[PDB]
Amino acid sequence: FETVASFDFRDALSKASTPVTVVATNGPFGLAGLTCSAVCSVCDRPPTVLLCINRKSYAAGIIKSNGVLSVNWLAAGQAVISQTFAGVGSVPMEERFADKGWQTIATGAPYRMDAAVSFDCTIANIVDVGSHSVIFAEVVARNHAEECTPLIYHRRQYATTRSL
Amino acid sequence: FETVASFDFRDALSKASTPVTVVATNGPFGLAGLTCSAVCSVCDRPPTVLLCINRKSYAAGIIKSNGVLSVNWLAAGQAVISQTFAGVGSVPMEERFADKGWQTIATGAPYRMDAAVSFDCTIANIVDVGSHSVIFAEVVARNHAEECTPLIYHRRQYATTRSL
Numbered sequence: 001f002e003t004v005a006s007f008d009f010r011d012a013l014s015k016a017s018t019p020v021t022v023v024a025t026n027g028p029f030g031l032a033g034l035t036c037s038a039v040c041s042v043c044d045r046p047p048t049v050l051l052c053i054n055r056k057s058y059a060a061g062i063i064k065s066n067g068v069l070s071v072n073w074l075a076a077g078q079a080v081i082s083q084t085f086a087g088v089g090s091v092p093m094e095e096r097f098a099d100k101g102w103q104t105i106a107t108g109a110p111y112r113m114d115a116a117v118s119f120d121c122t123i124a125n126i127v128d129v130g131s132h133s134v135i136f137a138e139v140v141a142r143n144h145a146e147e148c149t150p151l152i153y154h155r156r157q158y159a160t161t162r163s164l
Numbered sequence: 165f166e167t168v169a170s171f172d173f174r175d176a177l178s179k180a181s182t183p184v185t186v187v188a189t190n191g192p193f194g195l196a197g198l199t200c201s202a203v204c205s206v207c208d209r210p211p212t213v214l215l216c217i218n219r220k221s222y223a224a225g226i227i228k229s230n231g232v233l234s235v236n237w238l239a240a241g242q243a244v245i246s247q248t249f250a251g252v253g254s255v256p257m258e259e260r261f262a263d264k265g266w267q268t269i270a271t272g273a274p275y276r277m278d279a280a281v282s283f284d285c286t287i288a289n290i291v292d293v294g295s296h297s298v299i300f301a302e303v304v305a306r307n308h309a310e311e312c313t314p315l316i317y318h319r320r321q322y323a324t325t326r327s328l
């Protein structure tokens with residue numbers, strides 16, 4: 001079989017819906033983070049998530065060298081955080097974390113305490129596939145947030161959820 | 165660092181949102197499918213997605229031996245399909261594909277033609293983590309899909325999107 005055109009793969013996926021997260025890290029290689037929707041739960045023992053991130057991202061090599069990361073699922077009111085971490089405004093990495101709502105829990109990675117969900121993690125496995133590194137991380141702590149109406153991304157813009 | 169309790173991990177994840185897909189297959193080993201939310205896009209060259217499925221399931225066994233599969237991102241009106249393929253109502257595996265919206269495209273896997281996105285795929289690699297196989301699949305065809313607001317899962321209920 002021949003694979004579909006890269007153009008067709010991306011266009012088709014624009015019609016899917018995803019949550020929006022920020023993946024962040026800190027440690028001796030410095031502070032970095034980026035907006036990521038290619039994230040999912042893998043297994044619950046040991047508890048493990050994965051995230052796929054373009055090796056061309058400035059955050060990629062810093063995350064992999066720090067060895068720890070957080071995954072922060074954003075709430076519907078947090079689209080400006082998603083924009084910041086996607087490179088809009090070109091905010092310097094460190095500056096992205098200036099707001100007091102970013103703290104640490106266990107690893108030293110920045111955790112967004114009012115995200116719908118925030119997992120603090122250590123990297124367990126990295127598999128490089130095409131342009132991206134698929135990073136498997138084990139979850140060592142989490143936040144305890146009240147508001148969790150989701151920020152969603154769909155056909156190239158933000159959305160949230162509705163009943164039905 | 166100690167990893168969080170399994171119960172605590174599933175708990176937090178209920179507060180995150182996901183898309184809802186059906187993963188299906190057919191071939192020399194038979195017809196099978198199940199509902200899968202742990203799916204994501206990996207890279208666009210070669211166009212590759214991944215999905216995480218428990219190795220204990222009837223469907224996992226057949227998918228892996230057929231070597232081909234489709235991933236079908238469901239639309240907002242299709243919660244009944246998601247329920248069927250999660251085992252709600254105990255519909256026998258092979259009776260699950262009655263509906264005519266299921267057609268063949270390239271590999272012989274059944275593709276849901278009215279799904280928001282339907283990818284027909286060949287398995288490229290499998291990474292085992294805990295109880296799950298993370299299956300990497302290369303996309304060799306797609307449904308050229310009519311417009312569709314997607315099915316989302318959040319807080320143990322189905323939902324769809326709206327605007328901010």
Ligand SMILES: Cc1cc2nc3c(=O)[nH]c(=O)nc-3n(C[C@H](O)[C@@H](O)[C@@H](O)COP(=O)(O)OP(=O)(O)OC[C@H]3O[C@@H](n4cnc5c(N)ncnc54)[C@H](O)[C@@H]3O)c2cc1C
Pocket residue numbers: 020034035036037038039052053054055056057058059082085086087088090091092093094153
């Ligand atoms: C909804 C959504 C979902 C997304 N999902 C994903 C995904 O799952 N995976 C993925 O890989 N991408 C994803 N992206 C893309 C991603 O967020 C970013 O890589 C992309 O947005 C590009 O980032 P950037 O413009 O910050 O460029 P980058 O070049 O990666 O980073 C720029 C930043 O690095 C910093 N920096 C760069 N160079 C230097 C230097 N020489 N010295 C000091 N600091 C420097 C700076 O402080 C600057 O602001 C997603 C984007 C959106 C909007």
Ligand SMILES: Cc1cc2nc3c(=O)[nH]c(=O)nc-3n(C[C@H](O)[C@H](O)[C@H](O)COP(=O)(O)OP(=O)(O)OC[C@@H]3O[C@H](n4cnc5c(N)ncnc54)[C@H](O)[C@@H]3O)c2cc1C
Pocket residue numbers: 043044045184198199200201202203216217218220221222246249250251295317
């Ligand atoms: C919205 C939604 C999203 C879903 N997403 C996924 C997904 O991304 N991936 C996926 O694999 N399933 C997913 N499921 C589950 C899937 O659809 C089926 O429901 C699967 O065949 C479960 O059927 P069953 O519960 O009757 O298990 P069974 O009929 O009993 O099959 C065997 C059982 O699974 C077992 N088992 C279940 N969970 C674990 C575990 N975490 N570790 C070890 N053993 C386990 C046991 O080993 C036991 O024998 C999802 C379901 C819904 C409703």
Ligand SMILES: NC(=O)c1ccc[n+]([C@@H]2O[C@H](COP(=O)([O-])OP(=O)(O)OC[C@H]3O[C@@H](n4cnc5c(N)ncnc54)[C@H](O)[C@@H]3O)[C@@H](O)[C@@H]2O)c1
Pocket residue numbers: 041042043044173174175177178182201202216217218320
């Ligand atoms: N990615 C998955 O394997 C997944 C996702 C949702 C539900 N299921 C399944 O749920 C069952 C029972 O009900 P429930 O309480 O989990 O619905 P639930 O929505 O209440 O459980 C919460 C969350 O756990 C996450 N997850 C990651 N690995 C998981 C795992 N091994 N088991 C359960 N969740 C996992 C999911 O994203 C899910 O939404 C199953 O027998 C089953 O196979 C599995």
Ligand SMILES: NC(=O)c1ccc[n+]([C@H]2O[C@H](COP(=O)([O-])OP(=O)(O)OC[C@H]3O[C@@H](n4cnc5c(N)ncnc54)[C@H](O)[C@@H]3O)[C@@H](O)C2O)c1
Pocket residue numbers: 009010011013014037038052053054155156157205206207208
């Ligand atoms: N997985 C990723 O790397 C990923 C995911 C989303 C967006 N992006 C990127 O998205 C931008 C805008 O995204 P968009 O949805 O608005 O429009 P888009 O038409 O460029 O992409 C549409 C969808 O295709 C998928 N996708 C796009 N590029 C991919 C890649 N290189 N590898 C794997 N999947 C990919 C994603 O699911 C994305 O949402 C960028 O400038 C950018 O680098 C990358």
